[PDB]
Write an enzyme that holds these catalytic residues in place. Structure first.
Site, PDB file in Angstrom:
ATOM      1  N   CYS A   1       0.830  -1.194   0.000  1.00  0.00           N
ATOM      2  CA  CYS A   1       0.000   0.000   0.000  1.00  0.00           C
ATOM      3  C   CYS A   1       0.868   1.250   0.000  1.00  0.00           C
ATOM      4  O   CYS A   1       1.491   1.607   1.021  1.00  0.00           O
ATOM      5  CB  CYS A   1      -0.912  -0.040   1.230  1.00  0.00           C
ATOM      6  SG  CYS A   1      -1.778   1.488   1.608  1.00  0.00           S
TER       7      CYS A   1
ATOM      8  N   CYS B   1       0.112   4.090   2.398  1.00  0.00           N
ATOM      9  CA  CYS B   1       0.443   3.682   3.756  1.00  0.00           C
ATOM     10  C   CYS B   1       1.908   3.951   4.053  1.00  0.00           C
ATOM     11  O   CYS B   1       2.271   4.334   5.157  1.00  0.00           O
ATOM     12  CB  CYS B   1       0.220   2.193   3.971  1.00  0.00           C
ATOM     13  SG  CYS B   1      -1.476   1.589   3.760  1.00  0.00           S
TER      14      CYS B   1
END
Length: 104
Positions: free
Chosen positions: A28, A31
């Site tokens: 991700c 993230c």
């Protein structure tokens, strides 16, 4: 920033009245943008618990808390999830929430 799983989730939540949990995974990209932001906030707010919950490693905990996309940051008070942010966001969005929770 504490590495979280099922074994330490509750003891983490009890370590400070206010806690912040960053739901993340290695695939991700947003993230990983957020990771340094959260790490630096943890150093600035030692009176608040900061933890990372990897959703690949702990899918049941992510599901439990309704996490359906990443990043999700959940704010806890006294063990209760009280609010959240979905997406990478500026530091200042997370910080304003922390200050309110601390009664600053």
């Amino acid at each position: 920033v504490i590495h979280l799983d099922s074994k330490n989730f509750d003891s983490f939540l009890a370590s400070h009245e206010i806690a912040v949990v960053d739901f993340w995974a290695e695939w991700c990209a947003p993230c990983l943008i957020l990771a340094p932001i959260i790490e630096e906030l943890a150093e600035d707010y030692p009176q608040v618990g900061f933890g990372k919950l990897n959703s690949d490693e702990n899918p049941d905990i992510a599901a439990r808390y309704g996490v359906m996309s990443l990043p999700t940051v959940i704010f806890f008070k006294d063990g209760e999830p009280v609010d959240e942010i979905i997406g990478a966001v500026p530091r200042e969005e997370i910080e304003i929430r922390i200050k309110n929770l601390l009664g600053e």
